[PDB]
Design an enzyme around this catalytic site. Structure first.
Site, mmCIF file in Angstrom:
data_model
loop_
_atom_site.group_PDB
_atom_site.id
_atom_site.type_symbol
_atom_site.label_atom_id
_atom_site.label_comp_id
_atom_site.label_asym_id
_atom_site.label_seq_id
_atom_site.Cartn_x
_atom_site.Cartn_y
_atom_site.Cartn_z
ATOM 1 N N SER A 1 -0.831 15.674 -11.886
ATOM 2 C CA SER A 1 -1.083 15.322 -13.283
ATOM 3 C C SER A 1 -1.330 16.590 -14.079
ATOM 4 C CB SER A 1 -2.286 14.371 -13.358
ATOM 5 O OG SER A 1 -2.691 14.137 -14.651
ATOM 6 N N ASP B 1 0.843 -1.195 0.000
ATOM 7 C CA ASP B 1 0.000 0.000 0.000
ATOM 8 C C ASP B 1 0.871 1.234 0.000
ATOM 9 O OD1 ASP B 1 -1.931 1.863 0.312
ATOM 10 O OD2 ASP B 1 -2.428 1.334 2.405
#
Length: 330
Positions: A199, A35
């Site tokens: 992004s 994770d």
């Protein structure tokens, strides 16, 4: 040193991935959920409340010649999905894919929430976010990666998740055979303890690319892609009959649909998520309503590039003094 381990979907939907991890001496092999959005290595154990164990493999420290109680240390964690676990701490030898760390904090669960009990395939979590998020008190502990770093050939690990197939976690090297083209690296902020990046924008299907900054985290431990409501609405508007259902808890679509791809920007590069990656199947067994793999992040307080996004790429988690993320097509 290096390590290389195969990671395997837990079910036909790629809801999560499990990677075998050797703990203790002699080895006890547990299947952990790696994770990158948390920083605790915790396991089902001989200490876990018996009514909360249903098919998991447990770690038994009393059977490990190298286990040592970390006296006084406790831990307690709550995840984004409302699940939780807590317990005490041992140090022990932990190996992943041939890479060994001695003295790793192994957090032994005394209690787990129902979602963990109900998932017999996951024996615990191995956190790969920054060690500033580790929950051990009163002495915070380091992640497996942070403890391995100095020994690695390069201070990196890579995630290569499969679509309905196994993939690979590598530590200490970048497998130049595992991706196509070049790797585009992008800046990371560690201020929240995550692999947080920005992004450069998105496209829906064959549509034009929208240049827009989307801050979010690279999180292998989250199944879906959670993005701002504007982006998500633009995606699902291209699917006849898709709608946000408050009863189901997100966007659903007709199972008869063919989904468009979704593209996200990494600098000037583009990662394309095929439409089939976004289909999470019937909302309930036999339903003709299907659950979407792109969902709104509104009310979660962060955008999450979970497995839907990451499994479309070869992802480099660069833990050098200035961390960065890299993405390549594959």
């Amino acid at each position: 040193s290096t390590g290389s381990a195969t990671t395997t979907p837990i079910d036909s939907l790629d809801d999560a991935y499990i990677t075998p991890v050797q703990i203790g001496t002699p080895a006890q092999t547990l299947n952990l959920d790696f994770d990158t959005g948390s920083s605790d290595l915790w396991v089902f154990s001989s200490e876990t409340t018996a009514s909360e164990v249903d098919g998991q493999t447990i770690y038994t420290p009393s059977k490990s010649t190298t286990a040592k109680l970390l006296s006084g240390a406790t831990w307690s964690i709550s995840y984004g999905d409302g699940s939780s676990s807590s317990g005490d701490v041992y140090t022990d030898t932990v190996s992943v894919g041939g890479l060994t760390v001695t003295g790793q904090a192994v957090e032994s669960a005394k209690k787990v929430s129902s979602s963990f009990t109900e998932d017999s395939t996951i024996d615990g979590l191995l956190g790969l976010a920054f060690s500033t998020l580790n929950t051990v008190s009163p002495t915070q502990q380091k992640t497996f990666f942070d403890n391995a770093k100095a020994s690695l050939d390069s201070p990196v690990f890579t995630a290569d998740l499969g679509y309905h197939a196994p993939g690979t976690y590598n530590f200490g090297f970048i497998d130049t055979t595992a991706y196509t083209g070049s790797i585009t690296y992008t800046a990371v902020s560690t201020k929240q303890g995550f692999w947080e990046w920005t992004s450069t924008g998105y496209a829906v299907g064959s549509g034009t690319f929208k240049s827009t900054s989307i801050d979010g985290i690279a999180d292998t431990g989250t199944t879906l892609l959670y993005l701002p409501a504007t982006v998500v609405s633009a995606y699902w508007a291209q699917v006849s009959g898709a709608k946000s259902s408050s009863s189901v808890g997100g966007y659903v679509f007709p199972c008869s649909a063919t989904l468009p791809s979704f593209t996200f920007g990494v600098g000037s590069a583009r990662i394309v998520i095929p439409g089939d990656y976004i289909d999470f199947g019937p909302i309930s067994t036999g339903s003709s309503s299907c659950f979407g793999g792109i969902q709104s992040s509104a009310g979660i307080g962060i955008n999450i590039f979970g497995d839907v996004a990451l499994k479309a790429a070869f992802v480099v988690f660069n833990g050098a003094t200035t961390p960065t993320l890299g993405f390549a097509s594959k």
